[PDB]
């Protein structure tokens, strides 16, 4: 099963606008629907946006969100959650 | 012919502070 | 003597001391002489008042002044140690202070000091066993023209001679307080032989106005 | 612009009005001699050593105090200036005692250096020197006042930086004496720094006295872990031993000072120290063994167990590398009960958003704030340098401070809004009088000490504080680039653990008692052997044998913060790394190395073999942990508040009491502090 | 024009200096105080400052700084803060006793001076700082102040001028240093009498952080008479920049020590013979004189036969009319012992704040104590001189100058005596 989601994004870069607006839009409705699942939003300057997902016995799978849009980020989050 | 400043021959130890307290009424409101 | 405090049975942070009610009225009068706030300015007059009430400034007296004026106690310790008219050790009933600076020494203050110490059977800086007299050496006390000169408490006895000093010490020893001022027959600061200046009537209220 | 032109030996330099002659000379490069002047303190002008000659002027000015004027030519190598310096040095040295061999300011003495450079080479003073009497000023500071030069840096520091008003100058003339008129004790959380500011050796440290000379010591640059401030420090080492701890200038954190605990707790590192692997608690008493044996037993137990039956606790002095190593190990075992000793509300957004648990305004923004609300905290005894910054702002940039907690002496005037957690709702709804100040405030702050969060109503407290913060933002109309909500931490590893995702609070451990506990420097005593099953097999992994070590089926000695290169994040989110000063004592090994070796001995092997690979793992987990000395900003506190609103809890009516209510409680907090001897002396002196 | 002295009693400002006329308001009005004060006040501050300037009055305290110029620094447009006029009645200079008489025999002169000077400076109050020793003089001063308050001359609207003025009397304790401007301000503020750094100057930040002007008792007390009788009348006396009448305290070895008032620039011989009777044992039995107070260096009989009591004249003679406290010594005196006592005075009175004076006045005291006995050696006179020059220009306050100058005067005019005493000591 899934144990974590870790969303890394840039504080203010063109390639992280989709992720940044995804947080503002859908983050609340996701943390209020999967209350027991951590969703660690960690930002760092000049970082490459990348979603991190850790499953059962310490198996972590990564994707990319650079230059992706809000709906694409939401689709990726839904796919990892399902 | 005769010395006039004799009133200080009777001042007690509290004369200064008594005079200051008396002037406290005349003193104008502080800033 | 010393600028560090060591507690003893007397002069202890708990040794009794407090202003009388009339002294509290005087304290209010003193404090109201400075702008709002800025009341720490009264530390000097208030501490002098405490000394006038007691006779010397015990650590309890310093702490009480600091508390009533709302200043850190170190701000009062600094003042008490810095200024020389503040007595941090008990002083005799009459505090004799013989001026010794050059203008008086030239007019023989040494003889006055010698006669005083010989009469009181003490050395400069010591208290009489009766706790009645304390002899110290002080710098200029103003009135350098009436030299040699001494101060007993708040009075000036000046133009002194050995006979005069031992006589005004006899009066204090017994009773009564000798009248202050020069004892040389000249009232004060004037030329001894005779006036050489303001020897004619002063002029009217409007003399010489533009 | 509004800049004036001045000449330093003819070298034109641009300086704004108000710049002093000393600062103009510094801009050019010349370093005028000085004693009494300090950059962080008020100018005094006592020593007169900084006298310099202004061209076509009669007398010499005091460079430290004289404001420069247009067209002035400052001659620094002139005959008049050099003769003034020689005379001033002669006067300084006239009454000085010949104590150089037995003086702790051996090779660090500014009087020595400036006598060699700017003074004369002989003495014509043919009299008897004065001799002041020494005074007892507590167990931490030794007073050899005969060396004092009456510079008054100590007095100024105590009056301004520490706000204690205990030291002063008594008497006058050549008999002037610096100290407490009475037999006071100079006890404060910042008392030690007087030792640094004393230019001569009049004030020195009792624990360090006579031990070594400056030219011998090797100066390493590391970070303090006695609190969440992260005070940059310099560790002085001589032949593989810590000689003393000194401050390191960091304008954004330290500012040259360090707390008394940070300074004087280094003694603990040399006592009650775990120095060898130790096992066999089931057979009776703990007995020494070897790494390959203790790790074999640990690996056997780990292989036997799995799932939530295994759990870990991180507490106090732990490093991000060890935390991530342990997290990866337990995850590979399929466990997630890796907790930390200090609680944090995890009901709202919890640790999902970094803005929910960081001093978002940073330490240095206090000077930019207008109003400060200290909620249920005692800044003086937790984050003493944060309290120092608050006092600096209050003293200089007119600041206002209010406290919603127990009334304690913070060293500055503040409004006591009461010690009830319902005042938060009162302020939020506008029923309290403090809203009047909050109205005209422009740059508010609402600090919330974690000590308050560690109550059983911490969730309610945090929800209330955030809900008040939202209304403060809307009414005050503060920009989006000014963060008001802050949380002040008191544990070094709390922020790093939260970033790595450790579950705050040890609640899941009690919910599902594990069959194998993994204590990693967990001396807080939150979980005892009474909890857990009847044969839990606890594993202690730390440097000191304190509360945790006795309860254990195996001890694995780790390294202290002075012996390992470790990443520590402070309360404001800044990531900093220490440097290896000493080497681990005996068979002790780095904590992340021990974890990785245990992994490899077990079936599960971790994918790092070097510090840099562990750092890359940290980058993968939380990117900000590897950007050193850089404070990444944060966002979505609107989202944090949105999620907090939905939390349904009520603030218990109990008073908001700080755990450290008096100075006596400041000196014992960590394992090192509890094992320190000097801290015990300080505790006894305060209690007396 | 030339040849000064023989001031007529018509022109003496202090007409009760000797105390044989009533000093209370009743006698002060008879002698001419508080006359046309309302007119003087309503003539404005600019007119008063102009009168003081054109009079040429120079600060009667230690250093002589033009009074009009010094008081004009507070005539600047209001900054919204109160302005104060602090009167420096801490007569601490050894040999000086003139302020004592001005305060105990003519307090109303000082009080009206406070009023007019406060109007000129724009001040609202005027704290008088008087020694703690001068208890009876402070008591007389407050009796006079209360008389003024009760007569309406001060308070709500002074003399009907509509100007609000208050006179506060503040007593210090034992401290010669508290006569210094900034030290006096600090003492009033309640802290230790330790001089501040300059700049900022008192006229910019003063007592309680507001503008202030420290003035001598004589300087403030002369002002009402200057205003009434015209600045030109005051300028009539004296040479040029040294204008006015001065109170002289002739003390030491003189037949009739006295406090007298005389024309500025009166010859020293005339001052010592006409009023004080003459140096004990005749003019020939004269060794040296200290024209100023104690901070002024000596002048030997050779230089004092023709010196003129003036700022410029004594500066030319290498001394300075500090406070005009003539101290006379008559040959029989032990000159080095007397100067050693003066240096001991400065050692006792130094505040101790700043290193030059703190650590160098004690050095000079020790060396001078050795010199009095001859224990030192002739090569040490130049060491003492060099120490004096090191101390002179490097102190925060002028007390360092005052401690250095007497030693320089001794080393400059009586070096052979020092060498003779050292030789006699070495002969044992
Ligand atoms: C150590 C020291 C002691 C002093 N005592 C006195 C005094 O009794 N009266 C006085 O007018 N000035 C005294 N002064 C000088 C004052 O600082 C200041 O120059 C004077 O009060 C200004 O008054 P004026 O402008 O009328 O001259 C002293 C200065 C120093 C440095
Ligand atoms: S402070 Fe110490 S090292 Fe420096 S000169 Fe004095 S005794 Fe010598
Ligand atoms: S003890 Fe040290 S810091 Fe304090 S005044 Fe003396 S030399 Fe300066
Ligand atoms: S010169 Fe002497 S009295 Fe004046 S400030 Fe310096 S130490 Fe104090
Ligand atoms: S020298 Fe003695 S009163 Fe002045
Ligand atoms: S450094 Fe300027 S006087 Fe001390």
Numbering used by the authors:
A (entry chain S): 14 to 95
B (entry chain s): 30 to 60
C (entry chain E): 5 to 214
D (entry chain G): 6 to 693
E (entry chain F): 9 to 436
Article excerpt on this structure:
Mammalian complex I (NADH:ubiquinone oxidoreductase) is central to cellular metabolism, with key roles in NAD+ homeostasis, respiration, and oxidative phosphorylation. It couples NADH oxidation in the mitochondrial matrix to ubiquinone reduction in the inner membrane, reoxidizing the NAD+ pool to sustain metabolism, and captures the energy from the redox reaction to transfer protons across the inner membrane and create the proton-motive force that drives ATP synthesis. Complex I is a ‘boot-shaped’ enzyme, with a hydrophilic domain in the mitochondrial matrix that contains the cofactors for redox catalysis, and a membrane-bound domain that transports the protons. Here, we use a popular complex I-linked mitochondrial disease model, the ndufs4−/− mouse, to define the structural, biochemical, and functional consequences of the absence of subunit NDUFS4.
